């Protein structure tokens, strides 16, 4: 949801600490659990279905600030040439601007570059 309200933004677009790191959470809280490791193993063999349902009744995942990078590359690919000597300046402008509006649907914010490429190929 919101945050830990303890640490600053530690993101820096770092990584995904894979599962079974519950070794640490066993050091911390297995103190109220049992002497099995296949216990957690079956917890995972069910958390697969739990993840199915979580993504079903939760969302469809929202990616990253890497949308900026994929959109800048979409702009570089819309020109894909040395055609107009001004179409490229236009595309750079369009990327650096369109990536600002705080609501413009993040998928059309890529399909716009896609359509730029489309009519540039038709051009």
């Amino acid at each position: 949801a919101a945050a830990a309200a303890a640490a600053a933004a530690a993101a820096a677009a770092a990584a995904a600490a894979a599962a079974a790191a519950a070794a640490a959470a066993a050091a911390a809280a297995a103190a109220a659990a049992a002497a099995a490791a296949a216990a957690a193993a079956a917890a995972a063999a069910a958390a697969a279905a739990a993840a199915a349902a979580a993504a079903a009744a939760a969302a469809a995942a929202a990616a990253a600030a890497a949308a900026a990078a994929a959109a800048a590359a979409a702009a570089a690919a819309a020109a894909a040439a040395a055609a107009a000597a001004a179409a490229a300046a236009a595309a750079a402008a369009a990327a650096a601007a369109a990536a600002a509006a705080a609501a413009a649907a993040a998928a059309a914010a890529a399909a716009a570059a896609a359509a730029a490429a489309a009519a540039a190929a038709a051009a």
Partner: protein, 96 residues
Amino acid sequence: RNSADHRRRLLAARFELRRKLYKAFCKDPDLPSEMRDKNRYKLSKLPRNSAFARIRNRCVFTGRSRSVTELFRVSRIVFRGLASKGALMGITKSSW
């Protein structure tokens, strides 16, 4: 009643921004002198429909074509005839 403005609204949502704020791109900037009609004339000729002044925004309780209020989507008629009947949240007589 609403049968045609529905199709026209949806056709706006069809020839959406995805093509109209696109074929309006090369209109305002300057330097692309190379046939600005490929984004002005022969493609921005969207069939004389799917516009956004063309959508009268009717009521939806009755279908009173004009005098609609934009918030409640009601007509002037049913708004005042209904907030009388209740089912309107907090809308009270301004005996100020």
